Design a protein around this ligand. Structure first.
Ligand SMILES: Cc1cc(C)nc(SCC(=O)c2ccc(S(N)(=O)=O)c(Cl)c2)n1
Ligand SMILES: [Zn+2]
Length: 257
């Protein structure tokens, strides 16, 4: 029943998923002045040289590029993490207009979109078990602003018209997620949750300070996708973001400055 409309959007999720109103929900506004620099935070280690993408799917909420996570091929470690986390998929959240789209905000500033590279803690053996643990996931978030094209995004952008509607999927091999990264790995980090239902409180959020730039034509191609399935009335897939949630009893730490 859940989605991003007036009748089934974020404001409604608590009825089906009461943890919507819980103690460590995401996303949040990052208040850059009150985030605490922590000199013991390690550099983030992103090892994506052996990444194996498999498929891309429109799930009716976003599109997901899914990876083979049956071996240690594409992993995240270091940073605030004390375990190895395997890349399972990435997806984006974006807006109807360039002035909104991101889930995390920075001093209340919204970005055009937000990339989530979803990773799960290998001590829990698989993604389904990890999500049931307070330290089960590590999600690397990267802001997108509109300006110059991101060449590493283009192969993603070019396949979207093959997965226009809910439930469509396409083969998507040999995609290199290193082409979606900014120069700097400086980050903010805090304990939070999935930002869609089931909203499980199982995520260590790692949000990069440096946005990537995408072109107006790249982000336009995102807004051409559909929430509906093939042969149903067209609802453009836009504004598939959850707003900032109360920080409550949490401190956001910074790896820098
Ligand atoms: C195999 C698989 C992978 C993923 C990421 N989600 C699912 S079900 C949806 C889900 O659990 C999920 C949705 C959204 C997010 S987010 N927006 O990055 O916080 C995450 Cl981490 C998980 N299933
Ligand atoms: Zn997400």
């Amino acid at each position: 029943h859940w989605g991003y409309g007036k009748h089934n959007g974020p404001e409604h999720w608590h009825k089906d998923f009461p943890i919507a109103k819980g103690e460590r929900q995401s996303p949040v506004d990052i208040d850059t002045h009150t985030a605490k620099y922590d000199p013991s935070l390690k550099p983030l280690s992103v090892s994506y040289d052996q990444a194996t993408s498999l498929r891309i799917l429109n799930n009716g909420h976003a599109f997901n590029v899914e990876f083979d996570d049956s071996q240690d091929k594409a992993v995240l470690k270091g940073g605030p993490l004390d375990g190895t986390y395997r890349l399972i998929q990435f997806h984006f959240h974006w807006g109807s207009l360039d002035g909104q789209g991101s889930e995390h905000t920075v001093d209340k500033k919204k970005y055009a979109a937000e990339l989530h590279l979803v990773h799960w803690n290998t001590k829990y053996g698989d993604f389904g078990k990890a999500v049931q643990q307070p330290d089960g996931l590590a999600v690397l978030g990267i802001f997108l602003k509109v300006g110059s094209a991101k060449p590493g995004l283009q192969k993603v952008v070019d396949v979207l018209d093959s997965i226009k509607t809910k439930g469509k999927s396409a083969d998507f091999t040999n995609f290199d997620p290193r082409g979606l990264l900014p120069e700097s790995l400086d980050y903010w980090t805090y304990p939070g949750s999935l930002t869609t239902p089931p909203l499980l409180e199982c995520v260590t959020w790692i949000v990069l300070k440096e946005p990537i730039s995408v072109s107006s034509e790249q982000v336009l191609k995102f807004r051409k996708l559909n929430f509906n399935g093939e042969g149903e009335p067209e609802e453009l897939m836009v504004d598939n973001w959850r707003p900032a949630q109360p920080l409550k009893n949490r401190q956001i730490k910074a790896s820098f400055k």
